Symmetry: D3
């Protein structure tokens, strides 16, 4: 019920933007998604700095001036959670946007506001596995929108995918890029396992560089699971020994069906999903530097 907004905690109901904002009207903003986990002993924010660092990278990429440092945004999160006394699982949404009414597309020199909402949050995707479908919509291409930024207007594309998959009776979309390579869910990175090797599409194929994908790559290297950042085709998805989605909201979600073709809820996925939970729960000493305690 308290939300941070430009350096102040305000009630939920005052964290609002004019309807003439070019952020609303032109998809001109950036956002982030950050989890905090309650383990019974504390509340820990997962990879806080890395997210706020990417928030600012996203802004720089789309030419939005965010007048806060990653440290002051990081501090604001913790202060936003303390203000509300939350001792439970949360999703945290920072969003950067223009506060002023403006009809002109010329946004040079404008200065973003940032708001930080923390809300109680369970599971995005079914933990025992989802049914996925390749959609008709392709991922917006680097030549038209800067897709490595988590920029707000891009997610129209993501919405068309998420809705198509869902109206068609599946749990989540898979999007192919302009060249036809599997790249992303609607908000998720994607991993396959092919003969004991983990594959995820490289930065250049049009993906957003996920922090949960990054954690997955570290987990792999700890576990000695050979991993490649390599383009994935539909056919390799269809023929996968295992497949899974990753993201802040999704966590580690097995994909047990692609376009009607059943996939094993496999062992590589289970080992990653298990170790990711131990990590966020603060049960792996080595990865404690990524947990920010709130109390």
């Amino acid at each position: 019920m308290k939300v941070w907004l430009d350096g102040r905690l305000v009630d939920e109901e005052e964290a609002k933007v004019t309807v003439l904002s070019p952020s609303l009207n032109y998809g001109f903003g950036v956002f982030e998604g950050i989890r905090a986990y309650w383990n019974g002993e504390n509340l820990y924010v997962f990879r806080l700095r890395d997210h706020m660092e990417r928030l600012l990278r996203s802004a720089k990429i789309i030419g939005l001036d965010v007048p806060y440092t990653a440290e002051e945004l990081s501090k604001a999160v913790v202060e936003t959670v303390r203000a509300n006394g939350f001792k439970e699982d949360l999703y945290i949404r920072p969003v950067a946007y223009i506060s002023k009414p403006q009809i002109s597309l010329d946004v040079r020199g404008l200065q973003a506001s940032v708001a930080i909402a923390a809300i109680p949050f369970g599971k995005y995707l079914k933990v025992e596995g989802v049914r996925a479908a390749v959609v008709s919509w392709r991922r917006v291409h680097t030549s038209m929108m800067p897709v490595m930024a988590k920029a707000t207007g891009i997610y129209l594309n993501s919405i068309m995918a998420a809705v198509e998959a869902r109206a068609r009776g599946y749990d989540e979309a898979i999007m192919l890029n302009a060249e036809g390579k599997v790249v992303e869910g609607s908000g998720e990175n994607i991993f396959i396992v092919r003969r004991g090797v983990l594959m995820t599409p490289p930065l250049e194929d049009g993906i957003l560089e996920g922090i949960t994908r990054e954690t997955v790559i570290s987990i792999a290297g700890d576990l000695g699971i050979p991993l490649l950042e390599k383009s994935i085709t539909r056919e390799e998805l269809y023929a996968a020994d295992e497949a899974f989605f990753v993201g802040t909201a999704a966590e580690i979600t097995p994909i047990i069906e692609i376009d009607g073709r059943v996939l094993q809820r496999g062992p590589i996925t289970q080992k990653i999903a298990e170790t990711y939970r131990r990590i966020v729960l603060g049960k792996e000493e080595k990865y404690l530097p990524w947990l920010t305690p709130v109390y």
Copy 2:
């Protein structure tokens, strides 16, 4: 401070606001319109009001947004909005349809849109005497990725990249090529060239938004005996053009007097079409008076 219509009710512009958690703000899921009203001394006339509100609702059906108002209801809303502020001068009117619920999930199914209508004084968006335009590096977003024929909010991040690129680098406005490298639009305007006495404008299928100012030019070209072809334009046809201009609601009819440093005359067809458009919007052409909604 102005009154703004918001879901049926007139509120101060300071109250026409939406939660920062709205999937509209966060994920560019909304639609919008641009509509002018013109003061002619006698009355305030809103231009092609019904056509714009029908487009709002087509935009919305294209992106799967549920707007719970009719075109007639929206059109009345604009009239009530301008009146309650007693404006008697030129206005730009912005209808914006968006989700006023906080929602983190991308699954926007089932949600019903809000609609705000702001009417503001305004203004010429472009230099009447003409603009210098650049072909930008950024490609116009493609139909296979976003439904670009909707005036949908998220798509404009593409326009912004364009508009900033042109301006930052010296120019007044961008020209964007499609994925197949044909000329398609400005950043918020449709484009016309005149080649050998023939008007050319990119067709619907190339990636444009179907402009109402575009449509009006096509009617004007017919009144005036100027041949018109909805036909793909290449960057070479731009460079060689005898005349070029932008059109749109804010833009009106704006001559392009330079493309990538190559100079264009402010030409006779452009001026004829600009001149007629002004007659039309000011209520001086009988035939077009059903396009004008009087406010008072």
Copy 3:
């Protein structure tokens, strides 16, 4: 059993078989056709027989398949197959041209095709009252990679991908975009929209098979005074259409009442085209009697 024509002989349908090592089976090097015959109560009329057989032959020359029969021969062979079976009811007739020799090598030069022609009882392919369609993830196979204008066997793996994708979700049919992102085909049907009183169909160049039902529809539109444009269609124009329908030999004229959840009316143009097509194929339009081949 029922008799089937195979290389100039009427054989029982159990003998109408081809070695499993044919390069037509193993590499999709064949052509086919789809032809209907309709019983009007007096006689059984085969609809545009010669046009279908001419097109089989164009399909072959396109792919380099050597069909040792003329259009006229194949046309007569149909008429005898129907007669042999004593059919007095609506049929779908399938001419299939393919290699009867076993051959592992991809070098199919100089081989000579066989032709088999089967006539089968057949009602409707899609719901008469209208079908729900989904734009699929599969794009239409591109001209740069196979000769899509030919009705060629190996191409239809793409059509099956699309057809199954749509039906696996309980939609009735697929719509497929071409590589450039424009609507082109159902899995086995040409597509028409109505948009502001104008009938639009993707043009030849977009990657369609040149349907003969399509061609009929184009003649009927002229007869009826309906303005018609062969122009690229986007997904946005489909979503926003006033009406939409599929056409094909098996499909006839089927209204599209849903596309990606967006409802479309079963419209007046589609109805009037459906009703006129029906009267043509039953012999009730005297100008079209030349398209109707009597069997008895």
Copy 4:
């Protein structure tokens, strides 16, 4: 005559036929394989049988074809077909999976495939000393349109287009670029170049079929210490290569000595890979004895 396996029965090759109305014939909905057996003087060894049968099954699941046999079953069925025929010489074995039911409809869901397996005497597919290749006008069919990694029947119309184009001019084989312009395939072969001591082959994602000869070559390179990169190949890198060769079950290891008139040496890497492959398939490499299935 020679015996062929058809659905768990050894039949004479004249009975190994399929109705001409199968959707496998009419719509290219099938999968196949190519497997060799080699006579070394002591025994006939089938080369990587189980890997080929595993891949048949992956090909089917990719296309949604229901093959009611396991890899192991099909593997044994091969061994019996060879034995039935008393062959004691080099063979090409063709497993073909396809629908034995007649069906006009594109909805192939839930149908159950038949499998036929033929074993035929077979020498060389391409000149041992090297072949002249042409980059063809036809591009490899794209993943967005068919599932190229599957060895699926309907895809090979594209391969025939390419194969015929090259051979019509008296070249021995085709090279095909993918949609993005990168070298991917011969008509029926994977491609390798040597460029400055490094063996390069297009990668999985580029649109290739994952050849088992390709996979062997990759194991042999590791054995031999030859640095290997799976990276996209341009036409320029082919023209400029130190060496080039095609690989495939039928092709074995064939040097490419001419591409678009540009001469290439019959090189040392290609020779050493060819010689090692030969020794592997004859049972003279003890580490690879697990890839060799004895028939007798």
Copy 5:
């Protein structure tokens, strides 16, 4: 043996450019091809002004400054032919290029030279019909080079096509554009006949706007042959009742074979080829305004 060069007639051997010219080194020039026909009574230059007008349009498109008007270039042609006393069929090559040595790619402000050579010339293509082949090379695309200009560096693409077709045992190439639509020969526009309707690809498909194509469109309209400027696919080429190439050098050349598929030497082509010859020969009064007499 006399050639015009920057306002002077010089012998063939002095019409030369430094090897360090950025025109030679970077394909930065424009050119034209113009015929003159000897009819026994005079020598007439076909559509001289229209060609010199396009020369200048080409330069303007690639940003080459040509300091002559179309009229002065037109005059120079006639003066170049008179100087040589030619009374026979000629091809005329105007080429505009940079005279200065320069390694920098920055050609702004440079000022072209123009040279005008007139040479005796027979037939480019076999008058009774050619065998054509679709090539592996695609026409350079409008997004990379301004292909509506007859600019010199572009013709590398054309060369790769012409050579491929020719090394493969055919008479001429057919090039498909980036989208796969038939657009051009290596130096020729292309026409098909489909059920009595003439089709040629539109300006936008990547073609150069040929003057011989334009004459063909006028001839069609005189003859009441219905004509469409419409995209052509390979399949429509394969299934054509007739096909032909047009260009200054090619004239009207039937295409009697495409990729092994025989085409009729048809009647629409013959009527156009016949009327084009009557035209250039000065036997059609109506089209006399396009012939410039030399004597």
Copy 6:
């Protein structure tokens, strides 16, 4: 006035000229090189001379030009050329291979190239302290249209469009994206970014020319313990880069201190690599002395 080598003979630069009818001038059919020599006080050293001349000949084989000289002969020619002018200062050397015959026909088969070599004093092509770069509207020409890995003359019309666009609009240099919109080159330079301590440069397959200055940077990065990845770069990775630089023979190692108005530090890796390159070319690193051809 300088002596220039021309087909084996030394002539005054005024005589190193070619007919205006040459298919090289008219149709961009030729190849070229850029090579430096560096005065170090002790001698004049030509840098990577043999490597550049081998590239000339690869360029030529790629475009089908017949250059009738060996790499060794060309390399000697450069040495003889610099000597005959007695230069003892920094030079740019331009070899250019072209057709000295007048030929109107595009069929260039059978013709033999001439080669001229000019050696000229020069010069820094770019601001040592750094350049401002723009992403241009023009796409880098594609492999499916021209053999862009050849340093072929006609391709540069693309570079010129780029270079003029950047410069005309304020900037020092262009950056061009490929057809697939990945970052590929400057107008005559290869590009490097530094992201999180890692050097990145677009790989061979994306459309670059394989620069010798590029190769030298890859060797330098190895000497210096700086990790390097030949890997596609997106415009977002450019914008976010910690450092960026151009490399090429004329360019040397040029920092990029602005990309599309976004400011970059003149960074530490760039400076380290620039510094080493200068040591290398001036004969101060023993290991690289086989790269230096002494003139005297």
